[PDB]
Ligand SMILES: [Zn+2]
């Protein structure tokens with residue numbers, strides 16, 4: 001396989017289905033990436049993550065650089081070997097979690113662990129190298145929501161300067177440039193002209209893929225969709241489009257309708273341990289008393305191992321009791337659900353019936 | 368298969384190896400039973416528990432009757448169906464956890480949930496029926512350690528009265544009597560004559576197996592072994608001998624040397640989630656800094672899936688980070704370790720080299 005190849009096999013309106021080929025394997029698009037925070041997809045063995053259909057996982061650079069540490073992971077053979085996942089890994093740059101969980105300047109950011117630490121385009125790319133990441137995210141500056149036009153512009157500008165620095169850091173490391181891919185991130189808040197300026201700048205630098213950054217931050221789905229409506233067509237058509245941190249099933253469906261090829265989100269894992277299970281008739285909270293003697297599976301059609309073997313009543317009990325197996329089963333189911341969602345999307349695009357799928361999906365999910 | 372058949376295939380001194388055949392499957396003896404507290408072996412799917420080599424698990428009646436409730440489990444199809452374990456299950460009577468976790472009389476005990484509840488020989492046996500238990504423990508009275516001779520005697524007497532009541536409750540329920548087995552429990556603290564009186568009384572009532580109750584309560588291994596020395600030969604030779612709540616590896620080895628065929632204990636599960644891993648060179652606490660860059664498996668010889676795929680360094684990280692996968696891997700390893708211990712014991716008895724095994728095991732484990 002090549003370092004990186006993205007091919008589109010089929011289209012319907014703005015939606016695309018296809019594949020990204022990388023050395024560690026093929027990624028089917030549109031793709032959903034389970035989140036590995038600190039070198040683990042919570043409550044699942046890597047074999048289980050794969051069994052659900054995941055082709056790629058995400059790793060959180062901020063968490064890894066704190067614990068167990070980037071240099072340490074490299075000493076130990078890199079993230080894939082350390083955690084037992086041998087397929088592609090996308091790493092974020094660490095910058096988001098800096099702002100939400102942890103001194104800012106043109107050089108980068110210093111911060112204290114939730115221990116003093118530093119990140120910058122250079123160090124970020126370096127850390128992702130040390131981890132052995134297959135898909136490297138450029139380091140950008142977070143743009144809060146809402147942001148004024150002035151501040152959105154200043155920050156987008158900085159982020160494009162940081163994108164160039166990311167590109168150069170990445171390219172100067174031969175091992176990294178030969179074996180990994182680099183994605184740039186579009187900024188500009190909700191403003192069309194800034195989104196265009198950002199797209200243009202990223203395209204001129206040139207990346208293997210392009211993320212739409214800065215959304216799912218409080219603006220709500222209508223605004224997110226309106227921004228996607230004009231922002232995604234600005235990106236190069238022949239490269240992957242990644243919508244960072246977007247994961248409700250209806251968000252995913254609408255985002256694919258607007259040209260997005262890749263997603264990540266902690267909802268299936270997070271929501272799973274907390275009691276929320278996804279179903280084709282909408283989410284359920286398994287802790288509800290209504291499930292205490294319900295012998296049905298979490299979902300009536302789901303092909304996952306959990307739905308083949310255990311009842312709502314049992315999982316209800318486990319989660320009420322705070323048992324680890326409850327978290328394990330809920331998580332496996334929810335990630336499997338998401339992968340079946342992605343498969344149905346891929347198939348429907350390939351068959352030119354994605355519009356009808358989106359309709360059918362919503363009528364039932366929000367019934 | 369029959370309701371219950373115990374056959375001894377080989378002997379060495381007081382040690383025995385053989386099999387218990389029951390409707391739900393064969394149990395290899397000497398046997399170690401992973402503890403399913405509230406209808407789950409903590410952090411493991413039943414398929415994983417089986418993969419480690421377990422033939423039978425234990426269920427805690429006290430916990431189940433509190434949550435999710437005995438009647439509820441019966442409504443739902445019984446414990447095996449509810450939790451996804453289709454091999455034999457031994458249930459305790461609930462009485463121990465009453466005294467350690469929750470009004471006492473000749474009738475039984477009432478207590479408040481850690482909701483007011485009640486247990487007695489009759490209700491205990493009934494609850495174990497509702498759960499669908501394959502091996503039913505008679506309901507007895509706990510004898511604290513230390514106990515005076517007078518109190519040890521009074522309580523042992525009560526427990527033998529309760530043993531008769533257990534036997535009669537069990538036999539009066541045709542479904543239970545035809546499909547399950549009933550074990551009696553020997554009491555008498557550390558006193559030989561009371562242990563003899565108890566053995567005699569149990570044998571006269573007649574049970575499918577006989578537990579040595581009242582040990583591993585603070586007396587320490589030397590005293591436990593001294594009591595086993597005279598107490599186990601008092602039990603019928605042709606039925607299983609169960610030592611309740613005994614689980615350190617050296618305790619198990621010495622107990623088998625004295626005639627015990629069955630064990631349960633929460634150490635491998637409990638100790639696992641807390642960081643303790645069993646090895647043939649002795650336990651280790653994986654949280655220790657010494658393991659942060661150790662690429663070796665938990666144990667150099669262990670055949671378990673954990674030791675084939677992950678390093679000490681990774682598990683170290685997971686447990687330090689409070690990740691659920693750390694608990695999963697530690698537990699799978701420790702239960703697998705215990706099952707390999709039981710296998711080595713079985714094989715060595717079958718080959719007439721158990722004495723040498725016990726020697727070799729100790730010299731290395733306590734090196
Ligand atoms: Zn499912």
Ligand SMILES: [Zn+2]
Pocket residue numbers: 665666669670671672673674675700701703704
């Ligand atoms: Zn192992």
